From a paper:
Ubiquitination, catalyzed usually by a three-enzyme cascade (E1, E2, E3), regulates various eukaryotic cellular processes. E3 ligases are the most critical components of this catalytic cascade, determining both substrate specificity and polyubiquitination linkage specificity. To this end, we focused on a unique human [name] ([name]) that can catalyze monoubiquitination at K867 of its substrate protein [name] independently of E3 through an unknown mechanism. In this study, we revealed an E3-independent mechanism of substrate ubiquitination in which the Ub E2 enzyme [name] can directly and specifically recognize and ubiquitinate a hexapeptide (KEGYES) derived from [name].
The crystal structure of the hexapeptide crosslinked with [name] was obtained and found to diffract to 2.43 Å resolution. The hexapeptide is located between the loop containing the active cysteine (Cys loop) and a loop preceding helix 3 18. An L-shaped structure is employed for this peptide, where the 1st lysine (K1) and 2nd glutamate (E2) together constitute the short side of the “L”, followed by the 3rd glycine (G3) at the corner, and the remaining three residues (-4YES6-) on the long side of the “L”. The long side of the “L”-hexapeptide is responsible for the major interaction with [name], with an interaction area of 445 Å2, and extensive interactions involving the main chains were observed in this interface. Specifically, the 4th tyrosine (Y4) and 5th glutamate (E5) act as two anchor points by binding P164 and S126 of [name] through hydrophobic and hydrogen bonding interactions, respectively. The amino and the backbone carbonyl groups of E5 form hydrogen bonds with the carbonyl group of [name] L165 and the amino group of G167, respectively. The carbonyl group of S6 engages in hydrogen bonds with S168 of [name], further stabilizing the interaction. At the corner of the “L”-hexapeptide, the carbonyl group of G3 forms a hydrogen bond with [name] N125, and as expected, the N125A mutant of [name] failed to catalyze substrate ubiquitination. Regarding the short side of the “L”-hexapeptide, K1 (Cys1 in the crystal structure) is proximal to D163 of [name], which is conserved among other E2 enzymes and proposed to activate the nucleophilicity of substrate lysine residues for ubiquitin conjugation, whereas no obvious interaction was observed between position 2 glutamate and [name]. Collectively, our structural and biochemical results revealed that [name] specifically recognizes the hexapeptide in an “L” shape and localizes it near its active site for ubiquitin transfer in an E3-free mechanism.
Numbering used by the authors:
A (entry chain D): 1 to 6
B (entry chain B): 34 to 193
The structure:
Amino acid sequence: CEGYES
Amino acid sequence: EVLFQGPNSKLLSTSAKRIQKELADITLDPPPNSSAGPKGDNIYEWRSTILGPPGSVYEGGVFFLDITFTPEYPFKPPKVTFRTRIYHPNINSQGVICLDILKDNWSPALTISKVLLSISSLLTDPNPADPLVGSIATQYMTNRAEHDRMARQWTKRYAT
């Protein structure tokens, strides 16, 4: 998925 | 001044026809704990309310969703995003959702009721294999009790 956050 | 309030497609026929059919079914037979309908004049822009599934860490929370359809519906999935902040490994800070049927598993057979059921199921069963917030997916697997304490705290602080 697009929009990954740590 | 005079604004059409929707998309300039050549064929709104297929999308609008299917959207009105979905609107009527979901008002007749709403999924459990969920609601959805157009915000205003544009049947391509809906709004949804979801109660956090009972037994989940989200219980008692009230979550709002934005649902936008395109003129390619039902052959392209709608866009669906949380507006309420939520603490979940598959939902990022802007409410983007990582759910299979919203990208590569989308099928014209699926309806917006089904998307909401699946979203409810994703709240009770996170998918740490396709994380969208790394620390939360990590905490979900190594420190579950801390993940639940945070999801409960966030539900109380943001979803009420």
